[PDB]
Enzyme design. Structure first.
Site, PDB file in Angstrom:
ATOM      1  CG  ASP A   1     -63.562   5.554  18.857  1.00  0.00           C
ATOM      2  OD1 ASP A   1     -62.874   6.397  18.245  1.00  0.00           O
ATOM      3  OD2 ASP A   1     -64.823   5.620  18.885  1.00  0.00           O
TER       4      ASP A   1
ATOM      5  CG  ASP B   1     -62.295   9.547  15.495  1.00  0.00           C
ATOM      6  OD1 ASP B   1     -62.275   8.617  16.287  1.00  0.00           O
ATOM      7  OD2 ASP B   1     -63.342   9.841  14.847  1.00  0.00           O
TER       8      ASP B   1
HETATM    9  C1  LIG Z   1     -64.895  14.845  26.931  1.00  0.00           C
HETATM   10  C2  LIG Z   1     -65.133  14.624  25.446  1.00  0.00           C
HETATM   11  C3  LIG Z   1     -66.481  13.973  25.238  1.00  0.00           C
HETATM   12  N1  LIG Z   1     -66.708  13.588  23.823  1.00  0.00           N
HETATM   13  C4  LIG Z   1     -68.088  14.014  23.437  1.00  0.00           C
HETATM   14  C5  LIG Z   1     -68.037  15.014  22.294  1.00  0.00           C
HETATM   15  C6  LIG Z   1     -69.413  15.139  21.652  1.00  0.00           C
HETATM   16  C7  LIG Z   1     -66.514  12.222  23.658  1.00  0.00           C
HETATM   17  O1  LIG Z   1     -65.586  11.661  24.205  1.00  0.00           O
HETATM   18  C8  LIG Z   1     -67.392  11.350  22.833  1.00  0.00           C
HETATM   19  C9  LIG Z   1     -67.207  11.259  21.465  1.00  0.00           C
HETATM   20  C10 LIG Z   1     -68.043  10.435  20.710  1.00  0.00           C
HETATM   21  C11 LIG Z   1     -67.823  10.362  19.239  1.00  0.00           C
HETATM   22  O2  LIG Z   1     -68.741  10.336  18.470  1.00  0.00           O
HETATM   23  N2  LIG Z   1     -66.526  10.300  18.816  1.00  0.00           N
HETATM   24  C12 LIG Z   1     -66.271  10.251  17.359  1.00  0.00           C
HETATM   25  C13 LIG Z   1     -65.169  11.261  17.123  1.00  0.00           C
HETATM   26  C14 LIG Z   1     -65.689  12.653  17.472  1.00  0.00           C
HETATM   27  C15 LIG Z   1     -65.222  13.356  18.581  1.00  0.00           C
HETATM   28  C16 LIG Z   1     -65.744  14.616  18.906  1.00  0.00           C
HETATM   29  C17 LIG Z   1     -66.705  15.157  18.065  1.00  0.00           C
HETATM   30  C18 LIG Z   1     -67.144  14.452  16.958  1.00  0.00           C
HETATM   31  C19 LIG Z   1     -66.643  13.170  16.667  1.00  0.00           C
HETATM   32  C20 LIG Z   1     -65.805   8.824  17.004  1.00  0.00           C
HETATM   33  O3  LIG Z   1     -65.523   8.784  15.600  1.00  0.00           O
HETATM   34  C21 LIG Z   1     -66.923   7.797  17.251  1.00  0.00           C
HETATM   35  N3  LIG Z   1     -66.392   6.434  16.970  1.00  0.00           N
HETATM   36  C22 LIG Z   1     -67.467   5.405  16.841  1.00  0.00           C
HETATM   37  C23 LIG Z   1     -68.129   5.551  15.483  1.00  0.00           C
HETATM   38  C24 LIG Z   1     -66.788   4.035  16.945  1.00  0.00           C
HETATM   39  C25 LIG Z   1     -68.476   5.475  17.991  1.00  0.00           C
HETATM   40  C26 LIG Z   1     -68.114   5.689  19.321  1.00  0.00           C
HETATM   41  C27 LIG Z   1     -69.037   5.740  20.408  1.00  0.00           C
HETATM   42  C28 LIG Z   1     -70.381   5.503  20.117  1.00  0.00           C
HETATM   43  C29 LIG Z   1     -70.737   5.247  18.796  1.00  0.00           C
HETATM   44  O4  LIG Z   1     -72.026   4.997  18.397  1.00  0.00           O
HETATM   45  C30 LIG Z   1     -73.134   5.754  18.902  1.00  0.00           C
HETATM   46  C31 LIG Z   1     -69.798   5.241  17.765  1.00  0.00           C
HETATM   47  C32 LIG Z   1     -69.040   9.683  21.312  1.00  0.00           C
HETATM   48  C33 LIG Z   1     -69.181   9.775  22.692  1.00  0.00           C
HETATM   49  N4  LIG Z   1     -70.166   9.032  23.328  1.00  0.00           N
HETATM   50  C34 LIG Z   1     -69.885   7.783  23.994  1.00  0.00           C
HETATM   51  C35 LIG Z   1     -70.018   8.126  25.469  1.00  0.00           C
HETATM   52  C36 LIG Z   1     -71.188   9.080  25.766  1.00  0.00           C
HETATM   53  C37 LIG Z   1     -72.291   9.041  24.722  1.00  0.00           C
HETATM   54  S1  LIG Z   1     -71.602   9.513  23.283  1.00  0.00           S
HETATM   55  O5  LIG Z   1     -71.715  10.932  23.115  1.00  0.00           O
HETATM   56  O6  LIG Z   1     -72.179   8.756  22.202  1.00  0.00           O
HETATM   57  C38 LIG Z   1     -68.369  10.607  23.443  1.00  0.00           C
END
Ligand SMILES: CCCN(CCC)C(=O)c1cc(C(=O)N[C@@H](Cc2ccccc2)[C@H](O)CNC(C)(C)c2cccc(OC)c2)cc(N2CCCCS2(=O)=O)c1
Ligand SMILES: CCCN(CCC)C(=O)c1cc(C(=O)N[C@@H](Cc2ccccc2)[C@H](O)CNC(C)(C)c2cccc(OC)c2)cc(N2CCCCS2(=O)=O)c1
Ligand SMILES: CCCN(CCC)C(=O)c1cc(C(=O)N[C@@H](Cc2ccccc2)[C@H](O)CNC(C)(C)c2cccc(OC)c2)cc(N2CCCCS2(=O)=O)c1
Ligand SMILES: CCCN(CCC)C(=O)c1cc(C(=O)N[C@@H](Cc2ccccc2)[C@H](O)CNC(C)(C)c2cccc(OC)c2)cc(N2CCCCS2(=O)=O)c1
EC number: 3.4.23.39
Lengths: 323, 329, 323, 329
Positions: free
Chosen positions: C212, C32
């Site tokens: 990202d 990530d």
């Molecule tokens: C098919 C797989 C779907 N997964 C959802 C799993 C819950 C994702 O693609 C996903 C993973 C993340 C995530 O936190 N990613 C962080 C890494 C991660 C991955 C899985 C579980 C936990 C954490 C990543 O570190 C986030 N990066 C930043 C901080 C830049 C980020 C990204 C998007 C929105 C942000 O602020 C709300 C912050 C966020 C999302 N979203 C953006 C699109 C829909 C709304 S959301 O949930 O906020 C989606």
């Protein structure tokens, strides 16, 4: 007759007012033929949700009778809990002492409860459906000689056309047209009757059909639903059990329900809920051990309905389009 | 005359499972064996979910006795929902087999995190026909209708952690599994395995309670008013916001349930209804008792009761037999 | 170079394996660039979710160094908590002692965690993004003289075409074609760069763009998104922030992102996820104080990316369609 | 030179609100006044949700100074999300008014049950520009840029339940609201009202902690390791499954927070961080302290700190001033 006005809320739901206590403390109710208990939130409820509602105070009523038996009610949307009480309940012009649930905790009913405009639920089912073996209010009115016929009727509001009524104790001609056909209950529990169901060539003979004012959908067996929607230009929406379509979709089907005595149809206009020219279907797939259709608000919007405890029957006629 | 004994394996003195097979190649699955429901289901090889990746899966293409049905169906449980479609194939429970209708599950995403976190593949219902989705004759009834056993009955002798293993027995009663009298209680309805008993906890009494014997539930449920009264001044505490009750495991002031009929008396002492929760607190226990109200006041006599009492489920005589389970097999 | 294989999971996500301990206990990670901590679940974790995963045991490793500082990590999907530890971490052919989080509680990360196939998360952001001021693993490899260049690259899998790689320490020609243009970071925090963004006549100059790998969407300012989707035959789905369309919709737009040095485009094929001829858009509206696009997996699927700590830059080139 | 004093009203010794107006017909709203955010929003008459039905609503059609913008925007808070669009109109805070950009909220369904259950209509951010969605100059800065006040500063004197009412003051410092020294701490970043302090709870020390002064939070947050150490052997208990800590209200063994700079010392005794929870237990208290970890170790000094300490927020000098609040106004 005793008429309680059914007030449309933004074409989403309808509610009716009734009172509890000899000081007539006012509440907004869901009037629910799919359940059989009356509850109101108590001044002793302190949860976040209660602070936003009208509350009952037993101390301000001279006709209060303590019971205090603990009870929890379970609904699809969650649970409320509290204890049984007895007091005067007034529905339109009639009142009677009646056992009900004082609710002390609503945290298992959230966010639904805080997000809605009702205070409590007023069940209109049969005794065997109730927690606590409570005789239904309309039965009790008849027993205490305050009405002659233990029946009630629903004429539902139609957004921006006309208001609705729950009438207790007699059938008003002004509410319907065409023939009123009575269908015998198959069990004194829900208002449940036996109909053959057809959509095009899809059929289910002797389906159990539950008339439920407390539900804003038609529920259908899942295999029947899957068959009826294929090749229709309806889109199942991901992650949720809902379906959308173009409001003007000419391919949409009509439910037919038949008994030996009557035929009832429900066309797309009664089950489509407008939400960019797009409409959600108010139809949900649900399987039970007896293959069942829950004829909720969309059916009751088309058909005036009579719920007769003395005859163990549901009377169905076309609702008049205007009042 | 030939009892069919299926071994039952304990899980954390909380739940138990047993194995059976589907297909004429005897594809193996671990089941919850549930007198509180009346459908059999297994996850399909066509199930692509993450949960199904951890499970034994059913491949109809490998069984010569598979018969397609394909009627869609969705099963609703308290822990969630599974959906799929009906299929028919050989189902093998111990030494008995028959062609049988079951649900092949394709989606389990409405049944998580429960399902991945559990060691079962599917559920095998042992209730009555009117409890089933699709009006499926219960397996044991169907075995008798096909002349494969003489008596449509089954029994449960539940495993006890660190002590002995358990058996599901179809077709007869093994004397080795019980001691003391065996008393039969007539069903009040042919739906659950539901009987009428008077319930007492010393002072507190509820006459003619409906009691459901439910192997697929790891708790005892009681009417909420009865629960509130029984816990009055007990050195038990409700954990705030939660439906759960805790106490020192050594509490000597906990009550015994007593249930009676005109023919028998059954008791359930604290040792059967306490669950150690050392993870939360040294010497701490959870009361494995939940309050729940139905239109007829009801006790659900789940695993905790069945771990004490050997139980006989008799379809021909519409009854439940109850006897103290042998403490050492 | 050190290549970690990126394994597609049903065209939904991709994961990579790495090890912890001198006994090389194996884990599956989300890799990530949007975060900056490494965590794995501990054998001391007893929650329901942990029993389904590969767990770390410090006792079985001779190169374990205790820290024990409590820490909780917060993600959109929820929280995990535990404590800092130090041990050998092996990523492909390289290993180094490294500080990470041992997770003891995953109940605030459910149902996501039990419903997914990863064990933990391996962050690839900058030091200031990390809880605990942990130097990024690639920086540490370079400091401990195990690679010459503190950079890594992503070449993402494409379902049923080819697998992917995370490469540490050098840029392989086999992964891309056309020019590789480097864009300077605007802050050493995320891998965040400044691009002008256009869809048709809709534009946002000097948008903050975050690369990202941990996110499977393109996120767009809500007003930009509202403008770009009008008159397109895309259906917003009720109660959720998702959009559907016909997979063959010819009206769908292309994002353009430009710097003084490069131009990057993202056509509908890279952001459409097939789900009855219907596709969901992998695009989500999100507003931040600096108007931002999160260029997640759909962008990285089209473009090979180079993340260079020594030069404080992201290098972007067309990914080769096949390997 | 003329201070603008806005009265602050207490809510359950937990939160406080203050009123301001929008439109040149002075449409009234109750606000959270939040140094932890930097946008102003009000619910619109076009908001049809159930929550909005209980609130004061903004009708742009009744204001002659309304200027349409219509840029869509969605605000994300921990308690949820509200969405709408930008508008510009006269905003009146006490006696000062100016044309100002704000969000007219049309959907609040992602902010329930919080919003209906609360007595506020909207939020008025008092942070720095870089914290705002849409790059909106803070109100107090804009007042100074328009020459309506001399100094871009504001102060908080928080109400105390049953004792005295509170004031937000714009443009100057009222001596009547504090006692003892007033010490100013330079901001470490112009984003939150964030300063650098050494934190100690007797034994446990964290040097150079980032401390955020946040009027819109009813708690103190602390790094999770620091919290775990401070509670070590205290007669405090974690309620299982929850992030919450309880104790007898009379516990005489609870710690005092101490924060220090080179110029000042600030303490927070148990009486400022305990919340009575009689609903749960006679003589029981909740510690209004939450553990939370950020990339720089951080304390959020919410209402509990601000109820003790008068606070001065100075945009011209990029600083926070801190002094004991007068216990009787
Ligand atoms: C098919 C797989 C779907 N997964 C959802 C799993 C819950 C994702 O693609 C996903 C993973 C993340 C995530 O936190 N990613 C962080 C890494 C991660 C991955 C899985 C579980 C936990 C954490 C990543 O570190 C986030 N990066 C930043 C901080 C830049 C980020 C990204 C998007 C929105 C942000 O602020 C709300 C912050 C966020 C999302 N979203 C953006 C699109 C829909 C709304 S959301 O949930 O906020 C989606
Ligand atoms: C726009 C308003 C939407 N509300 C949803 C509010 C949560 C409903 O229309 C509604 C109300 C109820 C309901 O429980 N109704 C009971 C009465 C009630 C109403 C509001 C809050 C609590 C309770 C009613 O008593 C249920 N009747 C029976 C028992 C016959 C019923 C109906 C439908 C499904 C059932 O089994 C799962 C049972 C059920 C539904 N559903 C059917 C369609 C979608 C799935 S569902 O949630 O199970 C919908
Ligand atoms: C088996 C070991 C672990 N599981 C936890 C599952 C999340 C249980 O002990 C369990 C299984 C079930 C269950 O539905 N049991 C049905 C079978 C089953 C088992 C596992 C997963 C899915 C389904 C069983 O068929 C239910 N029988 C009836 C319908 C009689 C029942 C029991 C209890 C309450 C009921 O209605 C409210 C109905 C229900 C519970 N509960 C009792 C304790 C708290 C309230 S509860 O959630 O309703 C617990
Ligand atoms: C105001 C009185 C009642 N409310 C309960 C609201 C459900 C609070 O005490 C409250 C308000 C907020 C809040 O977001 N405050 C923001 C303003 C606000 C207030 C009410 C409703 C919505 C929004 C405030 O702007 C947040 N400031 C920052 C961004 C500095 C903040 C504070 C705390 C934690 C943060 O990040 C994890 C960020 C946060 C909390 N929490 C502290 C206690 C448990 C953890 S928490 O949920 O994060 C509590």
């Amino acid at each position: 007759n005793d008429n309680i006005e059914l007030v449309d809320f933004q074409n989403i739901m309808f509610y009716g007012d009734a009172e509890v206590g000899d000081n007539q403390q006012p509440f907004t109710f869901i009037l629910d033929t799919g359940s059989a208990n009356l509850w109101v939130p108590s001044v002793k409820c302190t949860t976040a949700g209660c602070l936003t509602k009208h509350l009952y105070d037993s101390s301000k009523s001279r006709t209060y009778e303590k019971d205090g038996t603990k009870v929890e009610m379970n609904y699809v949307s969650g649970t409320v809990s509290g204890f049984f009480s007895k007091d005067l309940v007034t529905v339109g012009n009639l009142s009677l002492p009646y056992k009900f649930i004082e609710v002390i905790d609503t945290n298992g009913f959230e966010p639904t409860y805080t997000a809605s405009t009702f205070d409590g639920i007023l069940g209109l089912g049969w005794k065997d459906l109730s927690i606590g073996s409570v005789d239904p209010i309309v039965v009790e009115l008849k027993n205490q000689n305050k009405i002659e016929n233990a029946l009630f009727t629903f004429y539902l509001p139609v957004h921006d056309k006309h208001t609705g009524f729950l009438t207790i104790g007699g059938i008003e001609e002004r509410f319907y047209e065409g023939p009123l056909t009575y269908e015998k209950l198959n069990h004194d529990l829900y208002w449940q009757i036996t109909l053959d169901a057809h959509v095009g060539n899809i059929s289910l003979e002797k389906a159990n059909c539950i008339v439920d004012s407390g539900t804003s959908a038609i529920t259908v067996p899942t295999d029947f639903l899957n068959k009826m929607l294929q090749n229709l230009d309806v889109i199942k929406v991901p992650f949720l059990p809902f379906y959308v379509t173009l409001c003007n979709n000419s391919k949409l089907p009509t439910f037919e329900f038949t008994s030996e005595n009557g035929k009832y149809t429900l066309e797309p206009e009664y089950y489509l809920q407008h939400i960019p020219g797009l409409c959600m279907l108010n139809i949900i797939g649900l399987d039970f051990p007896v293959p069942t259709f829950i004829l909720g608000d969309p059916f009751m919007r088309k058909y005036f309905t009579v719920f007769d405890y003395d005859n163990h029957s549901v009377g169905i006629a076309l609702a008049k389009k205007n009042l």
